[PDB]
Design a binder for this molecule. Structure first.
Ligand SMILES: Nc1ncnc2c1ncn2[C@@H]1O[C@H](COP(=O)(O)OP(=O)(O)NP(=O)(O)O)[C@@H](O)[C@H]1O
Ligand SMILES: Nc1ncnc2c1ncn2[C@@H]1O[C@H](COP(=O)(O)OP(=O)(O)NP(=O)(O)O)[C@@H](O)[C@H]1O
Ligand SMILES: [Mg+2]
Ligand SMILES: [Mg+2]
Ligand SMILES: [Mg+2]
Ligand SMILES: [Mg+2]
Lengths: 281, 281
């Protein structure tokens, strides 16, 4: 039916960072979880769905289960910093890049790129391939916050940590009234495709990078390679199924995402991929 | 004489967090330090000086060393997450307090206290005494950024992590031109006491807490117990010693502190401490 975490054993000797909603440690089927709570003045859903799409993409993602916790809908992310594994995020790494007078929190794309090539945790080709793999995923999903504290490495010395924190994908602000507006108006819809959301990663002019523009204009062989690579792993029939099998989501929402994913896939990915394909030899 | 870190062996497999500038892991004297660089739109001094003052108050603090790399002036912090020790900040810990539907990054004082009473990493009373300890030293050093991410615990389970990131203390935005301006204009010296810095922490109404006002009107026995506890360790000669003995510091700057420290010492600490005593009986 639907999971319920309410009674599972909490682990009180563990906490989690991040500035959106609380989270606690707890066992489920003999495994530990980080259980994100929603904030309130709907990213629990983005987090579950987005990740499951990333999985279907053959990329290493955190396991995610919708469930209830004391009358609050909750996303449970399997915990990958157990068994004596520690997470160091990219931020902390970029902070070692002292020859750039810019701080690790900074998301200017070129610097981020530079640090990848200059870091010594992971073979820079592996790391660079991952990064763009992730950027494509993020493109499809509309991740508006893949900052340097939203990916990283596990140490026991290092390996890439599974993609996490996709709570910022797929329109977390959208509610049934918004889903409604957009679905009934191509103009609105378009604004949520070309203009916004934008990547948290910046150009050398300090603007957030535009998903559509960037991807349909890049000559970065690394970004282009990763398109040609992930494009085939994309399976709309599955992605829609992930959406259909989302546990609490209203129906109106469910079809907002259906539409939105088809559109993103078609007006950004398809297009960019198609050009990507055309640049060979 | 003075220390050049410039040629010391760097550890290309550890990084560090924080928004304010780069840092790298290197061996000095056979040991890891975290070496913090200055951002360039002065804090390396604040850190060094502030930690040596904290130490002299008898509190457990990171050891600081002031050196040069490549003509940079840089502060070295003895790394305390070597030997399997993993640092975990209060913020994550506060993030688990799901009952207050506020996040683990918000610095509302009451919420913070609640988390102290209700967390299972440290015996609560001990931590309530630490927090308060630190608050007092911050009052002395004038810390405007003691955020839940700026203190925490250590584990291989928990012990309190030595006070770190005190680099936001002791007027870091002030330069030789500012020091002069303050050193002359009394009205200017006044407000860097009665007006700011203010603590990052907050009251129920959202406003940040005024060091002076709070310190001299509060009936929180735990804050006051802290005052009485700490006051007798304030060694004004040793402190001015610490200022005179600072390695690259300019003299106008050296004295800006001397002044500024006497000022906070007598204008807040003394006054508040006096009221404390009289408080019993
Ligand atoms: N599956 C996981 N296992 C262990 N630690 C995790 C996991 N997922 C996240 N974390 C850690 O917990 C912190 C909070 O998780 P995260 O999903 O990033 O929360 P968030 O509030 O969405 N982060 P953000 O929005 O970028 O400030 C992350 O920064 C990681 O350090
Ligand atoms: N002595 C130490 N040993 C090991 N780790 C440390 C040490 N000091 C600080 N750290 C860690 O590395 C980070 C260093 O940043 P720190 O200098 O403490 O604050 P900052 O760089 O000013 N950023 P912030 O406090 O977020 O505004 C801290 O957040 C800790 O996680
Ligand atoms: Mg995060
Ligand atoms: Mg997020
Ligand atoms: Mg810090
Ligand atoms: Mg600081």
């Amino acid at each position: 039916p639907t999971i319920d975490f309410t009674f599972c054993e909490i682990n009180p000797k563990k906490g989690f960072g991040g500035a959106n909603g609380n989270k606690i440690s707890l066992f489920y089927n003999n495994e530990l979880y980080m259980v994100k709570f929603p904030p309130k003045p709907n990213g629990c859903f983005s987090e579950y769905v987005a990740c499951h799409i990333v999985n279907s993409l053959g990329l290493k993602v955190q396991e995610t289960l919708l469930g209830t916790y004391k009358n609050k809908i909750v996303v449970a992310c399997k915990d990958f910093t157990t068994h004596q594994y520690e997470l160091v995020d990219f931020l902390s790494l970029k902070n070692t890049m002292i020859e750039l007078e810019k701080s690790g929190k900074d998301t200017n794309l070129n610097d981020v790129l530079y640090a990848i090539d200059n870091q010594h945790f992971i073979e820079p080709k592996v790391l660079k391939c991952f990064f763009w793999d992730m950027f494509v995923a993020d493109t499809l999903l509309g991740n508006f916050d893949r900052h340097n504290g939203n990916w990283g490495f596990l140490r026991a010395e290092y390996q890439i940590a599974p993609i996490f924190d996709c709570g910022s994908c797929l329109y977390p602000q959208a509610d049934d009234v918004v889903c409604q507006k957009v679905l009934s108006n191509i103009d609105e819809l378009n604004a949520r495709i070309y203009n916004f959301p934008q990547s948290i990663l910046k150009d050398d002019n300090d603007k957030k990078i535009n998903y559509y523009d960037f991807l349909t204009q890049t000559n970065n062989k690394d970004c282009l390679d990763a398109l040609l690579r992930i494009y085939p792993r994309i399976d709309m029939n599955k992605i829609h199924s992930i959406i259909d099998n989302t546990p609490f989501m209203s129906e109106i929402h469910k079809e907002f995402l259906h539409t939105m994913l088809d559109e993103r896939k078609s007006k950004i990915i398809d297009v960019a991929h198609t050009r990507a394909i055309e640049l060979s030899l």
